Amino acid sequence: GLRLNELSPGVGAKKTAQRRGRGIGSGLGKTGGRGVKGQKSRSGSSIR
Amino acid sequence: MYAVIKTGGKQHRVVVDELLKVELLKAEQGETITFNDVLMVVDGETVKIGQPVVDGASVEVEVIEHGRGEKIRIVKHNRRKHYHKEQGHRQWYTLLKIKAINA
Amino acid sequence: MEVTAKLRGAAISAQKVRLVADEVRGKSIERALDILTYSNKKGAVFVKKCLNSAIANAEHNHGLDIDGLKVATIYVDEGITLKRILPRAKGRADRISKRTCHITIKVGE
Amino acid sequence: MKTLSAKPAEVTHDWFVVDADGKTLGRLATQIASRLRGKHKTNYTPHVDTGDFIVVINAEKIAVTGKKAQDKKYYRHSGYPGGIKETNFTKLIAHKPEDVLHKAVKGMLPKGPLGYAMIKKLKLYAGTDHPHEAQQPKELDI
Amino acid sequence: ARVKRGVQANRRHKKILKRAKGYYGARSRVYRVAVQAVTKAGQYAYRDRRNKKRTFRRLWIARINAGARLNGLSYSRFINGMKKANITIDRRVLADIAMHDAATFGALVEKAKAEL
RNA sequence: UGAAAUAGAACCUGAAACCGUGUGCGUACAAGCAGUAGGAGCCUCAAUUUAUUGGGGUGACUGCGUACCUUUUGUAUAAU
RNA sequence: GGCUCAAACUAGGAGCCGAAGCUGCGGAUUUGAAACUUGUUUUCAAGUGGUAGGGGAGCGUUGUGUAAGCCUGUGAAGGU
Structure with missing residues (x-):
């Protein structure tokens, strides 16, 4: 290894995790991918 | 003492040693461009109107510089629809100095 | 030169003092003192006190001729507000603001 | 090169006199409205008054076709409940002769500060004489 | 790794408010009104x-109509x-010549009139 | 006194809302989401041989133009 | 508003206006295509309204290493 500065993970290795509800531009704002009023949009929903 | 020329999809009424900014051209700075398709030359009292081009008449311009214009903010918003987008724009221009209007 | 005096903390609303300050702004020292001594408003005793202190400062600290002075600037700012409680009917309580004012006066030739 | 405006200080309003004798009301009114707006001028800019002063004589002699002299109704509301009032073209010509042509032109001018300023250049008189020989209007058959 | 957001919030709100200069009342003062x-x-x-491209052509056409009617035919x-x-x-350019060069526009009208 | 006192004790820094004072321009014949696109005039700085540009403030007048969110088949909505 | 051999209607004809449609000019970008070939370069073709939603690429913030570094009273952070 050269240095603790120049260590890259090797493109494709990492990905940014998704963050719901952080504005219009991120693609996951407001509802956060959940849709509208319904059971599956709620805070403890699942598929059973 | 003036002419009408076509540059960048637009038309311009030009006089000598006039600084005119037009659309971006593929010419270097200080390079001299000759417009030999002028539309009209009005030299004092003589009016030469080309149909569509005044034959023989020409104007030489000098490419003073190239640059970006004023930044423009483009704002798009769809009310009640969770839609907003912004972007910036700066149009490219060239500055020409009219050198002469050949009849 | 400009000689200042400040009367930070007058127990009165700045709104109630600005009416008095508007009538002495720009006047000469003598005319301003006349207006203040014959005003029926409570803000005038505060403004007169601050003005007299500014004139004293100009005479003593700065050695200026008082006969040629004038109220060059005057403004009233809001001070610290005391907060109190006023009972109302049906077991309800309103907050009361006891406002104070800061008076700044600058005399000058 | 740019497109310049008329620069109000540089604009001149010319005086013209029009004889409204037997002419059609609206056919004359459109011409007058265009002249008051300044549309006949190559310096026309819609935010500047580039018009001309129009002095109309024989305003009580303007004509309407059909049966409009007796059927053209002029309504106004006075601001009071039931306060709707109506008058005829012929009654209004007898009573306030200039108001027929003034009303026709006001309808054809734009509705705003500039339009109010351009209607102020319409000087219309019943009779053959106008008190504006000092301005020397030029006779304009329009 | 607690993040306090005051500094970034301040400069974001300041950006919007600085873009809202000249606006009356709350529109240049309070962010909630200024941002919209x-x-x-x-x-x-x-x-x-x-609409500017739309409006300046209307201006040019009106000027050319005035100029052509000044000597001869209509705009159309x-x-x-x-x-x-x-x-x-x-x-x-036509409206510029109509407004600033009456002789050249006269010659230009004479050409169109000779062509019809 | 202190390096500093708009470090003076409610005392480091001292934002915003909110309230003043001063200067410049506009505003008392004109109808509406208060802007936008033009645009006269005035004021002010810098170059320039001297009103000609450029930057800044203001904005007469003209066109266009019924907030945002949510929820909805659909909202300027007098729906939240 | 106003309009009556119309500025109405019927039947033709010729001009013109008219949109963010199309063309012109300049620029960005998605996909695919011939190559010094990983945006190394020049182009070409077809695209680029968008809610729910799916996919892609980034910005900024706090903290750790890099860092006993680098910057900083010849003025850091913050504020304007």
């Missing part, structure tokens, strides 16, 4: 960037005459 005022200004500017017949004469001069 700035968005609406942007929307108007976007629409008016098209003038434009037909230019098209027949193969004169490529645009309405912007």
Whole structure:
């Protein structure tokens, strides 16, 4: 290894995790991918 | 003492040693461009109107510089629809100095 | 030169003092003192006190001729507000603001 | 090169006199409205008054076709409940002769500060004489 | 790794408010009102960037109509005459000549009139 | 006194809302989401041989133009 | 508003206006295509309204290493 500065993970290795509800531009704002009023949009929903 | 020329999809009424900014051209700075398709030359009292081009008449311009214009903010918003987008724009221009209007 | 005096903390609303300050702004020292001594408003005793202190400062600290002075600037700012409680009917309580004012006066030739 | 405006200080309003004798009301009114707006001028800019002063004589002699002299109704509301009032073209010509042509032109001018300023250049008189020989209007058959 | 957001929030709100200068009342003072005022200004500017191209041609056409009627025919017949004469001069330059060079516009009208 | 006192004790820094004072321009015949696109005039700085540009403030007058969110088949909505 | 051999209607004809449609000019970008070939370069073709939603690429913030570094009273952070 050269240095603790120049260590890259090797493109494709990492990905940014998704963050719901952080504005219009991120693609996951407001509802956060959940849709509208319904059971599956709620805070403890699942598929059973 | 003036002419009408076509540059960048637009038309311009030009006089000598006039600084005119037009659309971006593929010419270097200080390079001299000759417009030999002028539309009209009005030299004092003589009016030469080309149909569509005044034959023989020409104007030489000098490419003073190239640059970006004023930044423009483009704002798009769809009310009640969770839609907003912004972007910036700066149009490219060239500055020409009219050198002469050949009849 | 400009000689200042400040009367930070007058127990009165700045709104109630600005009416008095508007009538002495720009006047000469003598005319301003006349207006203040014959005003029926409570803000005038505060403004007169601050003005007299500014004139004293100009005479003593700065050695200026008082006969040629004038109220060059005057403004009233809001001070610290005391907060109190006023009972109302049906077991309800309103907050009361006891406002104070800061008076700044600058005399000058 | 740019497109310049008329620069109000540089604009001149010319005086013209029009004889409204037997002419059609609206056919004359459109011409007058265009002249008051300044549309006949190559310096026309819609935010500047580039018009001309129009002095109309024989305003009580303007004509309407059909049966409009007796059927053209002029309504106004006075601001009071039931306060709707109506008058005829012929009654209004007898009573306030200039108001027929003034009303026709006001309808054809734009509705705003500039339009109010351009209607102020319409000087219309019943009779053959106008008190504006000092301005020397030029006779304009329009 | 607690993040306090005051500094970034301050400069974001300051950006919007600095773009809301000149606006009356709360529209240049309070962010909640100013931010939608700035968005609406942007929307108007976007629409008016098209409508300007729309409005200046209306101005040029009115000026050319005045100029052609000053010596001869109407705007519609003038434009037909230019098209027949193969004169490529645009309405912007035409209105400029009508407003600033009456003799040249007279000669230009004479060409269109000779072509019909 | 202190390096500093708009470090003076409610005392480091001292934002915003909110309230003043001063200067410049506009505003008392004109109807509406208060902007936008144009645009006269005035004021002010810098170059320039001297009103000609450029930057800044203001904005007469003209066109266009019924907030945002949510929820909806659909909202300027007098729906939240 | 106003309009009556219309500025109405019927039947033709010729001009013109008219949109963010199309063309012109300049620029960005998605996909695919011939190559010094990983945006190394020049182009070409077809595209680029968008809610729910799916996919892609980034910005900024706090903290750790890099860092006993680098910057900083010849003025850091913050504020304007």
